[PDB]
């Protein structure tokens, strides 16, 4: 059998697509925020690059 | 420890039966069954000459003897003969009472 580390299920890892690994933007989330407005609008959904092979086996079944 | 009867402690000859040898240097020689040892498969017929030596022993005498004796053999003699020698053996024919299972080759008894 296999398992998927449940931390990856709702975390900034989206297996969706042509197999690529979309991920969130992180800096300043729900901690203090008193700085740039176009920065605070910039924590949404981008994607990682040299890590994707680990994230796939994090959740090959795409939960 | 290996029993030596793959033949189920059965014997195809009685004691005192006339018998011919199939194999060895005695093939084609003749003899009555002087001693029949079933479970070991040993068969004694007169004429299996063997020169046992002993005047070393004291018990028979301070000297003793070389002497001629029998050497018992495997059920590798033909069990029973007839005017035709050798050959196999049918059974289950009836005696004058029928209580004796008997023997035959082509036909006959014993």
């Amino acid at each position: 059998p296999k398992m998927k580390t449940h931390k990856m299920a709702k975390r900034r890892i989206k297996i969706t697509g042509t197999g690529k690994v979309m991920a969130f933007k992180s800096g300043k989330r729900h901690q203090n925020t008193g700085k740039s407005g176009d920065e605070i609008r910039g924590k949404g959904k981008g994607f990682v690059l040299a890590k994707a092979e680990w994230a796939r086996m994090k959740l090959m079944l795409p939960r | 420890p290996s029993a030596g009867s793959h033949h189920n402690d059965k014997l195809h000859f009685k004691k005192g039966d006339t018998v011919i040898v199939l194999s060895g240097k005695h093939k084609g020689q003749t003899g009555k069954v002087l001693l029949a040892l079933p479970r070991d498969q040993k068969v004694v017929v007169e004429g299996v000459n063997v020169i046992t030596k002993n005047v070393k022993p004291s018990m028979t005498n301070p000297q003793g003897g070389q002497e001629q004796r029998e050497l018992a053999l495997h059920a590798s003699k033909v069990a029973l003969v007839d005017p035709e020698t050798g050959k196999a053996t049918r059974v289950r024919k009836q005696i004058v009472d029928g209580k004796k299972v008997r023997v035959a080759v082509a036909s006959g008894k014993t």
Binding site: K7, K10, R11, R12, W54, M57, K58 | -
Partner: protein
């Protein structure tokens, strides 16, 4: 054949890796290096300072429709086909899902499918080519 003439297809069976077994190939250490955690199994997959950790926005369920494109459908040459009945005999695999249709390529000739759900424009390209489409009522 005669069976001692049998041979599996060339390159259909590669031999094993006999890691070990001395200087003609893969010697003292097997494939493993000199020391480190190349010893006996244990660690799995994580960097062992920090996790690459990001936040989580979270929901739990979903329920998809089964999919039926109309491009594979126009090639059928035998229309007026009931949903469950006449689709089961030519694919449409899921047994505990609902059916739906997408607007992939051109519907062309008339038909009458009875799907469990459909996109708003599939009625456009369907009825525009004279075609009743009956969702469950």
């Amino acid at each position: 054949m005669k069976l001692h003439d049998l041979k599996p297809t060339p390159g259909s069976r590669k031999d094993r890796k006999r890691v070990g077994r001395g200087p003609g190939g893969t010697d003292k250490t097997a494939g493993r290096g000199h020391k480190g955690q190349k010893s006996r199994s244990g660690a799995g997959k994580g960097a062992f300072f920090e996790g690459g950790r990001s936040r989580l926005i979270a929901r739990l369920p979903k329920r998809g429709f089964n999919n039926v494109g109309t491009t594979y459908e126009v090639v059928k040459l035998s229309q007026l086909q009931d949903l469950e009945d006449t689709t089961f005999d030519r694919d449409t695999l899921e047994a505990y899902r609902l059916v739906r249709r997408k607007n992939r390529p051109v519907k062309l000739l008339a038909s009458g499918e009875i799907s469990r759900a459909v996109t708003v424009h599939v009625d456009a390209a369907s009825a525009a080519a004279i075609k009743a489409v009956e969702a469950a009522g």
